[model samples]
Target: GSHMTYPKYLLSPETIEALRKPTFDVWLWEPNEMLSCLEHMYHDLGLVRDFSINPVTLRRWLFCVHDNYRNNPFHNFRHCFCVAQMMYSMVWLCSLQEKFSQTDILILMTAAICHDLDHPGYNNTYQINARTELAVRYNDISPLENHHCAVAFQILAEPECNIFSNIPPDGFKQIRQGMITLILATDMARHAEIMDSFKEKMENFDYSNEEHMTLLKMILIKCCDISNEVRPMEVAEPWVDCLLEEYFMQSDREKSEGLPVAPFMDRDKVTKATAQIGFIKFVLIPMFETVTKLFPMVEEIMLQPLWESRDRYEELKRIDDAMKELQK
Candidate 1:
């Protein structure tokens, strides 16, 4: 009469509070705990009441989403949970409900959870450069991101798992496009174009402008996608470990299979601090700074943690460098 994919946990009030903060430590939760928190995010955001999502269908859809995520060193279900938790935090921290439509908030949270769905631990560079099946299918245009959208929609196609069945056809079409656009924007290849467009629109930013709001939603998902550095050092450091391992594995496979390797992904060339420092500075900081422009309150709550994390990585790198010099 029943099938259990994983054990489910009822979140405590304390757990719910922590999940609402940007500094929530996701590594503390098991897979089932994360799933519960995801359910809470929808309820907390009023998506369930607003869109009339069936309780069981929501659970089934979430489980289906989790099952689709491969057990990579990173880019797995836990990473998806981290991204979604952070998205929920942003909504609370930035008072997004005031600035965005109910549908927009739905798009933001849903996209974050499903953004990396079915990730293969290999990046788009490897996909296109190797001319893999995904690359050929999508014609070298954000193939991995395309596949993620494909998988997300495929899961939703099941009648029992279609959490969006209550939404009208036209409204669902808008959400479909919104979610896909936000998912595609997660591709680093489009980083510069999205950022440049965002920066230009920032000066005269109008939240009610449909175009402006979509751009903002895109920016929010991108930030949450890579916002691990903005958390406490203890919580953030472990992610660096998992991510580096995935990069190393991909680069190793690339070398064996005769594909160009990014120096950043080369095992011999990177250390804990070395892999993280530049990313925090160049990508994380600049992208976060853009958000602070939209919501000044994030400066103290989020940017401070980001800056501290950057400094922490710099110190780690210095220690490694000195040890190397002594060995010489």
Candidate 2:
């Protein structure tokens, strides 16, 4: 009803075309471009038509969601958009439309878009160490992720932005449950739990089983959430810089507050090349290797980038090490 009063922003043909490209760099896109991409994905998935959500209502909801993200360096609206775009690409490249229901797709996309909403530029570690209000509220249980889900749903509760309002009670219930699960799965604290479960599932995946399918969807969203390592170097490198900047900011705050600075977050102790290499080797490669083994088609498109970035970082680290040796 209030949609008519909202500003109308349409995606240009060029933007729409770019969204469809598998290798498109979403990092280059502005906030408006991200909004247009979400709209395009919704239309492409036929979510608006199927759920009876008006196009204008969808647009307004997108605007509201975009506005809710803070202007943080890394975990801002742009990062959310990148995760959503990567989720879309993974779904397309893996031909998941055939494997997953429309409800599954809708929830995955929503979770991706809202997964890091209202991030405080500090990670969960800082929140807990600082004993902030959020840490107290959630009792230090994945506080940042818990806060993100709460804030995301708070935005959705607004009459003007409730995208799921039109859905039937049962459908809404399903989507809400799935959305919560997917978003919460993004907590790095649960990384080992999810990765172990995913690795076990891959041993004997059953596409026909609903439970197995649900697990697969969760793993896919998690992979996409940290997908920078699997993105092209040009795209992946800048994200590392943004993350380091955010980490250093947190470290500065930690030092000022008399809290222990996290390793890699301490600017003096962490070299960019060394940090990147460690993450690539220990986290990115193992995760993507498992994912590509499950979805072998992603080997070239996604897994290749992880290997490329690892090599690039390794080379840089080698040169730096050689320089240190020469100085010695």
Candidate 3:
């Protein structure tokens, strides 16, 4: 009850209830309320009891994590909240509690929550090409992810905010190691490599095999990271708006700085359907269906809506095509 300094409040009963399902619209919630919502996430997910973490430290850790996230339109705090919320829903819907270890669950949630820490409303390629300090520090190797991991651990390095203090050194090592693995995996540079490996092992994915489990954890974080299409379209569409805005912000900077602008990131070049169609078809569906193979139950909740989103974008694109034809 850190009320004197950082007062917290309970959300409405229905609001708390909605977070457990995939249909929750994270864009609608403010960061202040989302703070309480995620404070309650540990309560709902039972991570507090599983790790013997102090509620004080947990709250402090959450606050510290939130503090690191700057107000970029897309990769802002809400996107962080959105990803973790989806991770929570997936853990709930997938019965991951039965399938994975408690420690692994912690890694997934923690990784999802802090994956985009201190995003500068820019991307890795921007950092590298611009020769920003982050790129120099990490030597152009996932400068953004490296920054997040560094910042993620910096909070842990503090005694007051350390949630993992209760863990033994041996366990802490892998938890630390595993978190870096999952966080770095969020860099889209390795998207195909990660998916291809998952596909290679899908039929015989062995839970007991440490390597297989690691790949699964990576996929889950990636799924939740850009998981807009998995939700109902009404809930999902606004995320695209935020993402495109950020992309254009970067592209705009690239143009002003005389850096090469990526065509898709250019505001004028990309339409909504144009931006979404290939993402939904190539990235979203493939990942969801790959995951659905392991957990067949998620097909309806996670995979089906993705296809609908893909088709919705397709239909909209077709309309644009028709209008062009009529103009001629």
Candidate of highest TM-score: 1
Give the local distance difference test score of model 2: 0.84
**What TM-score, over all chains together, does every model reach?**
0.96, 0.93, 0.94
What is the RMSD of candidate 2? 4.4
Question: Per-residue lDDT of 1-328 in model 1, one digit per residue for the tens?
Answer: 2343433496767788889997788888888788889999998899999999999999999989989999999899999998899899989999999988899999998899899988989999999899999999999999999999999999989999998999999999999999999999999988989999999999899877988988999999999999888888888889988998899999999999999999989977778897788888889889989999889988898889989988888988999999988977
Per-model clash counts, in order, read: 0, 0, 0
lDDT of 3: 0.89
Query: How do the residues 140-221 of candidate 3 rate in per-residue lDDT, one tens digit apiece?
Result: 9999999999999998999999999998999899899999999999999999999999898887889999999999999999
TM-score of 1: 0.96
Clashing pairs in 1: none
Poorly placed runs, candidate 2 (over 4 Å): 1-14, 323-328
Model-by-model lDDT, in order?
0.90, 0.84, 0.89
The clash tally of candidate 3 reads: 0
The top-ranked prediction according to lDDT is 1
TM-score of 2: 0.93
Worst 10 residues of 2 by lDDT: 1-10
Error of 2 at 57 (Å): 1.3
